[PDB]
Amino acid sequence: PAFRTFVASDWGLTHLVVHEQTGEVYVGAVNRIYKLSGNLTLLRAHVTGPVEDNEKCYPPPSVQSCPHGLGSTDNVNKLLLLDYAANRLLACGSASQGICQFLRLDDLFKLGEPHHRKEHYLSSVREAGSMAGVLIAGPPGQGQAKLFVGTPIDGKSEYFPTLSSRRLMANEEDADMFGFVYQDEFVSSQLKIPSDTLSKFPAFDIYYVYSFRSEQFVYYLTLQLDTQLAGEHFFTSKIVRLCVNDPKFYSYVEFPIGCEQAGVEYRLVQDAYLSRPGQALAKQLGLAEDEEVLFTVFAQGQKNRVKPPKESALCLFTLRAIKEKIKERIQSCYRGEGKLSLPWLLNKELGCINSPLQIDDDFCGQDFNQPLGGTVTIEGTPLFVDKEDGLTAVAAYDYQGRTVVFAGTRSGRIRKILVDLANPSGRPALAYESVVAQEGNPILRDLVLSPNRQYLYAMTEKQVTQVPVESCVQYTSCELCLGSRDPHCGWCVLHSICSRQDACERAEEPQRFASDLLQCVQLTVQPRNVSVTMSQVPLVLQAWNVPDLSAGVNCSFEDFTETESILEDGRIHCHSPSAREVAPITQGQGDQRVVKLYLKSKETGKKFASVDFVFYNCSVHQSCLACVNGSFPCHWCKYRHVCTNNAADCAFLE
Amino acid sequence: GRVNMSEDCPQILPSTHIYVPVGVVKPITLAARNLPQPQSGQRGYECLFHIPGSPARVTALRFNSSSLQCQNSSYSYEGNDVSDLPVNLSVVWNGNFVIDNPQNIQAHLY
Ligand SMILES: *[C@@H]1O[C@H](CO)[C@@H](O[C@@H]2O[C@H](CO)[C@@H](O[C@@H]3O[C@H](CO[C@H]4O[C@H](CO)[C@@H](O)[C@H](O[C@H]5O[C@H](CO)[C@@H](O)[C@H](O)[C@@H]5O)[C@@H]4O)[C@@H](O)[C@H](O[C@H]4O[C@H](CO)[C@@H](O)[C@H](O)[C@@H]4O)[C@@H]3O)[C@H](O)[C@H]2NC(C)=O)[C@H](O)[C@H]1NC(C)=O
Ligand SMILES: *[C@@H]1O[C@H](CO)[C@@H](O[C@@H]2O[C@H](CO)[C@@H](O[C@@H]3O[C@H](CO[C@H]4O[C@H](CO)[C@@H](O)[C@H](O)[C@@H]4O)[C@@H](O)[C@H](O[C@H]4O[C@H](CO)[C@@H](O)[C@H](O)[C@@H]4O)[C@@H]3O)[C@H](O)[C@H]2NC(C)=O)[C@H](O)[C@H]1NC(C)=O
Ligand SMILES: *[C@@H]1O[C@H](CO)[C@@H](O[C@@H]2O[C@H](CO)[C@@H](O[C@@H]3O[C@H](CO[C@H]4O[C@H](CO)[C@@H](O)[C@H](O[C@H]5O[C@H](CO)[C@@H](O)[C@H](O)[C@@H]5O)[C@@H]4O)[C@@H](O)[C@H](O)[C@@H]3O)[C@H](O)[C@H]2NC(C)=O)[C@H](O)[C@H]1NC(C)=O
Ligand SMILES: *[C@@H]1O[C@H](CO)[C@@H](O[C@@H]2O[C@H](CO)[C@@H](O[C@@H]3O[C@H](CO)[C@@H](O)[C@H](O[C@H]4O[C@H](CO)[C@@H](O)[C@H](O)[C@@H]4O)[C@@H]3O)[C@H](O)[C@H]2NC(C)=O)[C@H](O)[C@H]1NC(C)=O
Ligand SMILES: *[C@@H]1O[C@H](CO)[C@@H](O[C@@H]2O[C@H](CO)[C@@H](O[C@@H]3O[C@H](CO)[C@@H](O)[C@H](O[C@H]4O[C@H](CO)[C@@H](O)[C@H](O)[C@@H]4O)[C@@H]3O)[C@H](O)[C@H]2NC(C)=O)[C@H](O)[C@H]1NC(C)=O
Ligand SMILES: *[C@@H]1O[C@H](CO)[C@@H](O[C@@H]2O[C@H](CO)[C@@H](O[C@@H]3O[C@H](CO)[C@@H](O)[C@H](O)[C@@H]3O)[C@H](O)[C@H]2NC(C)=O)[C@H](O)[C@H]1NC(C)=O
Ligand SMILES: *[C@@H]1O[C@H](CO)[C@@H](O[C@@H]2O[C@H](CO)[C@@H](O)[C@H](O)[C@H]2NC(C)=O)[C@H](O)[C@H]1NC(C)=O
Numbered sequence: 094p095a096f097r098t099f100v101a102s103d104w105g106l107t108h109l110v111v112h113e114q115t116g117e118v119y120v121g122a123v124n125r126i127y128k129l130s131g132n133l134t135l136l137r138a139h140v141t142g143p144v145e146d147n148e149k150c151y152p153p154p155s156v157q158s159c160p161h162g163l164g165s166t167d168n169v170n171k172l173l174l175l176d177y178a179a180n181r182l183l184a185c186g187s188a189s190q191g192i193c194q195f196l197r198l199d200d201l202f203k204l205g206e207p208h209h210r211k212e213h214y215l216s217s218v219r220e221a222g223s224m225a226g227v228l229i230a231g232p233p234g235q236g237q238a239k240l241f242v243g244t245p246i247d248g249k250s251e252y253f254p255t256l257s258s259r260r261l262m263a264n265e266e267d268a269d270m271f272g273f274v275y276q277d278e279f280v281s282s283q284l285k286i287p288s289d290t291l292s293k294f295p296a297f298d299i300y301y302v303y304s305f306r307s308e309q310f311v312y313y314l315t316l317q318l319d320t321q322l323a324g325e326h327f328f329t330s331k332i333v334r335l336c337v338n339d340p341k342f343y344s345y346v347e348f349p350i351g352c353e354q355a356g357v358e359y360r361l362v363q364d365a366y367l368s369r370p371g372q373a374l375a376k377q378l379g380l381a382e383d384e385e386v387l388f389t390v391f392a393q394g395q396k397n398r399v400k401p402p403k404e405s406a407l408c409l410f411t412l413r414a415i416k417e418k419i420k421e422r423i424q425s426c427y428r429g430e431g432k433l434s435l436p437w438l439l440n441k442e443l444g445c446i447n448s449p450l451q452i453d454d455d456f457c458g459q460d461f462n463q464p465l466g467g468t469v470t471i472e473g474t475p476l477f478v479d480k481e482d483g484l485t486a487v488a489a490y491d492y493q494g495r496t497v498v499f500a501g502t503r504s505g506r507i508r509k510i511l512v513d514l515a516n517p518s519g520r521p522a523l524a525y526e527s528v529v530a531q532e533g534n535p536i537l538r539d540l541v542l543s544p545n546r547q548y549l550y551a552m553t554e555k556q557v558t559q560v561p562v563e564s565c566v567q568y569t570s571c572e573l574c575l576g577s578r579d580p581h582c583g584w585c586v587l588h589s590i591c592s593r594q595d596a597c598e599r600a601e602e603p604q605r606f607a608s609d610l611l612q613c614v615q616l617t618v619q620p621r622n623v624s625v626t627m628s629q630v631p632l633v634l635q636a637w638n639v640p641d642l643s644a645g646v647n648c649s650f651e652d653f654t655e656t657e658s659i660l661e662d663g664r665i666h667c668h669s670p671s672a673r674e675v676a677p678i679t680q681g682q683g684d685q686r687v688v689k690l691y692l693k694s695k696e697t698g699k700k701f702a703s704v705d706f707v708f709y710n711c712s713v714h715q716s717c718l719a720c721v722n723g724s725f726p727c728h729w730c731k732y733r734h735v736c737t738n739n740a741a742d743c744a745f746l747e
Numbered sequence: 748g749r750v751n752m753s754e755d756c757p758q759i760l761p762s763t764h765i766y767v768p769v770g771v772v773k774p775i776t777l778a779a780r781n782l783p784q785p786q787s788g789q790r791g792y793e794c795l796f797h798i799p800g801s802p803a804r805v806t807a808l809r810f811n812s813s814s815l816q817c818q819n820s821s822y823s824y825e826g827n828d829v830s831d832l833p834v835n836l837s838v839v840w841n842g843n844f845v846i847d848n849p850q851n852i853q854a855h856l857y
């Protein structure tokens with residue numbers, strides 16, 4: 094087989110997303126945004142790129158003249174978001190103080206690209222993927238669609254907010270776009286970087302890696318700078334959250350996050366992926382059905398966010414456990430204990446105000462004790478650690494209970510991990526590894542399963558790659574099929590192929606489908622060794638772990654002959670071929686020919702079960718030694734000076 | 748982008764007269780109808796002033812299907828012979844596509 098693939102002809106790629114209805118794949122890149130079919134054929138290509146511009150210029154040349162010299166620069170797709178409700182694609186770029194694009198869903202027709210007002214500008218930042226966010230909507234007429242979006246700022250504190258809550262109007266031409274949900278002269282639905290904190294720490298900035306909507310909130314995994322850790326730059330990876338229904342922005346929370354493996358620190362997020370656990374992991378992790386989970390990837394230490402270490406660790410957080418750490422922290426500040434502790438935001442530390450309240454998970458923040466930080470860094474449950482080849486990306490999914498995890502590598506490889514801590518095993522075990530861009534093109538965070546969940550689109554700097562979740566047909570034998578362990582694979586006994594339960598016809602029936610190696614087709618023949626000179630010999634066949642064959646069975650010694658068989662007890666009775674048929678095989682191979690006797694099922698008409706069957710030839714031995722002291726039952730005739738199976742064919746008795 | 752009806756055509760609508768003093772930095776807001784969103788491989792808008800002395804090329808911004816604006820600039824003609832000079836203006840996009848001007852709207856340079 095070959096891996097279905099889309100190659101990046103000219104430029105680097107940045108983002109990928111899948112349409113839940115169509116399976117169309119949209120692909121953000123530098124200067125380009127593509128629409129692709131499910132099998133990665135090019136469907137449509139939008140030019141978004143090389144634009145005459147300059148990063149230093151505020152409002153970009155379109156609105157005002159800038160004295161700074163302009164040059165043809167690349168427009169990096171910073172963000173990509175599917176707005177199914179308004180049949181379109183939010184395709185947020187850079188290189189125009191970060192103006193956002195709207196492309197129509199089915200043809201990439203530019204519906205709108207607002208850039209007059211200051212809100213239509215998002216950030217000067219030219220870095221890909223340092224931005225993230227979520228689209229959330231209500232029905233038309235009600236409280237309209239909103240976008241929550243984090244971005245870096247590059248020190249342009251007064252131009253852009255790092256985190257914001259913005260409006261999404263139905264008209265793309267409408268000027269109201271990317272305007273804040275509630276703006277006041279006192280408080281706006283945004284969060285800015287304070288100027289005092291940039292004067293103190295020169296180039297502090299918030300880089301937003303992943304983001305997701307959960308229940309009624311919005312989380313972000315972030316990277317920040319040294320503020321109690323002027324000097325050098327060291328980063329701290331944190332979780333952020335907001336209530337969706339909090340125009341005031343009072344719900345903001347921020348806990349440091351990481352995990353440790355045998356006294357080695359992993360504190361830099363590279364990617365995450367919110368998912369389900371399915372019956373398996375849920376049960377022994379102690380969860381309800383609809384309880385969520387967060388797979389993550391961290392690098393070692395707190396050094397070099399620009400170029401992190403190889404040493405990387407896949408951790409785990411249950412959202413119930415992060416919800417408890419946040420509820421526990423709020424029911425703590427509402428006891429008046431300590432300070433808010435959020436360095437970059439509030440430079441002078443304001444204190445926790447005591448008050449009697451019903452602290453719930455439904456709590457959406459209040460006026461005093463305001464935006465607040467976190468003291469106790471939240472530790473995650475480790476799963477798998479790569480030391481020679483850095484993890485880059487992750488996804489996961491529910492399959493028939495068992496929880497499959499996908500992991501990109503710096504090499505261009507994907508790992509297929511069953512997480513088995515909650516499962517019986519000692520620790521979560523790798524099942525399989527696969528190749529995408531072998532030469533060493535790293536996999537990018539945007540790694541999405543298809544809608545049917547049959548494939549997994551894996552993106553690199555330079556190519557998208559349709560990697561199948563299930564491809565058990567690469568497995569040739571029951572023994573290797575169930576040996577790989579990647580849980581989709583079973584041996585469909587009578588078809589003699591390896592594939593999933595829903596793909597094996599009649600699998601539901603007894604012994605027709607094998608799932609543990611012990612169910613494997615095992616076959617034996619009573620007369621294992623039969624002489625060339627014999628003909629139509631009766632043979633008995635014992636087979637175990639096989640479905641009801643009352644449909645009928647034939648014996649085929651190979652693709653040479655085929656004899657009909659009848660069934661009695663737990664045994665199959667068929668005959669050897671005729672001398673007329675046997676010799677056409679044995680001619681040339683001399684001493685003996687080991688031949689794979691199959692069973693051909695009448696229902697399928699495919700050979701499934703095999704045995705070592707021996708066709709021995711005595712006569713061709715031309716000396717006593719070869720004849721008797723060989724490996725077979727052969728008799729030598731002193732006097733005739735010939736080797737044969739029959740005692741009577743000898744000269745006489747003595 | 749199909750036009751079947753004459754009222755749906757890309758055209759520039761008039762406002763109360765466009766007054767432009769010579770040697771003064773001014774913006775010139777315009778209204779219009781069904782102004783196209785420039786598509787793939789297509790540039791944006793400009794205002795071209797047909798002054799026999801000097802023809803000025805000023806790039807503009809299309810705000811929506813119904814309003815334009817040439818950017819802060821000053822204009823002149825060489826003569827000092829006539830106080831009130833009406834000037835043919837053409838609104839272009841993607842270099843050479845001139846939008847229709849039915850009322851033949853002019854800019855008065857005074
Ligand atoms: C089990 O294995 C045996 C032994 O290996 C196989 O029997 C052999 O069959 C092939 C036929 O395809 C024979 O090969 C051909 O031989 C002939 C000439 O054979 C003469 O010389 C033999 C060698 O000394 C001799 O044994 C023969 O005598 C036998 O026959 C008589 C009469 O039936 C009998 O009474 C005797 O007791 C002997 O049994 C005989 O004098 C020859 O024409 C062929 O050679 C041509 O082709 C080759 C290849 O293309 C080429 O290289 C040559 O140049 C030439 O053009 C060919 O070699 C072989 O002789 C048989 N072996 C024996 C010992 O007789 C057989 O495959 C298996 N048995 C069964 C029952 O299936
Ligand atoms: C398509 O896009 C076009 C152009 O982008 C829009 O046209 C604009 O319409 C808006 C109305 O929303 C007009 O805005 C008005 O501007 C006035 C400003 O004039 C002053 O300007 C300067 C600087 O402030 C002063 O020095 C000078 O002396 C002027 O006085 C405001 O005064 C108006 O505000 C009033 O109305 C609003 C809304 O009702 C109130 O909130 C205020 O309190 C106040 O009463 C007003 O904001 C603007 O002039 C038009 N743009 C241009 C470039 O001219 C279209 O709206 C849009 N069309 C569609 C269909 O979407
Ligand atoms: C060629 O194919 C044949 C298939 O028939 C294979 O023969 C079998 O070989 C294995 C060992 O290699 C034997 O297993 C052993 O059984 C021993 C007990 O033996 C008695 O019971 C047998 C079955 O109940 C019985 O056949 C046997 O009688 C034999 O000996 C008699 C006296 O010599 C003779 O007259 C008979 O004709 C008959 O051959 C005994 O009473 C046991 O002690 C061992 O521990 C071992 O388990 C099978 O019994 C063999 N099957 C048969 C039918 O004889 C043979 O392996 C193949 N050859 C090669 C080289 O691979
Ligand atoms: C885009 O992707 C789609 C799927 O996402 C894909 O189209 C599908 O192709 C498959 C085969 O690759 C087709 O599945 C077939 O279904 C019919 C029943 O209608 C069967 O007869 C077929 O069986 C044949 O193939 C088997 C396996 O190779 C053989 O064992 C057998 O002998 C048969 O010859 C097969 O199961 C299917 O028609 C479509 N899917 C859908 C939903 O229509 C396609 O590869 C991509 N297309 C493009 C244009 O890029
Ligand atoms: C399970 O085993 C049974 C019995 O062992 C087996 O039955 C066989 O069926 C085939 C038909 O498919 C029989 O072959 C036929 O025999 C006639 C003479 O009577 C021949 O003329 C025919 O041969 C022609 O067709 C062949 C194939 O296209 C060509 O190779 C040839 O050149 C001829 O044109 C015809 O096929 C055969 O006789 C029996 N076997 C025996 C031992 O009698 C069957 O294959 C298996 N059953 C099932 C349901 O698959
Ligand atoms: C400024 O614009 C005006 C008006 O658009 C120009 O004046 C006139 O332009 C019109 C075109 O609409 C010419 O009318 C033509 O008339 C003939 C009649 O035979 C007709 O066949 C054509 O279809 C067309 O309608 C008209 O000739 C022209 N006026 C003159 C006196 O030549 C004017 O040219 C522009 N000013 C400058 C300085 O270029
Ligand atoms: C004949 O069979 C005998 C006995 O099985 C073989 O004897 C071997 O002899 C060597 C000495 O050269 C010993 O070291 C081996 O241990 C013996 N093997 C066994 C299995 O007993 C002998 O190899 C055979 N000879 C021929 C010519 O076939």
Ligand SMILES: *[C@@H]1O[C@H](CO)[C@@H](O)[C@H](O)[C@H]1NC(C)=O
Pocket residue numbers: 772773774819
């Ligand atoms: C230029 O235009 C801009 C935007 O309309 C305006 O802010 C400014 O006042 C103008 N400058 C001058 C010198 O007229």
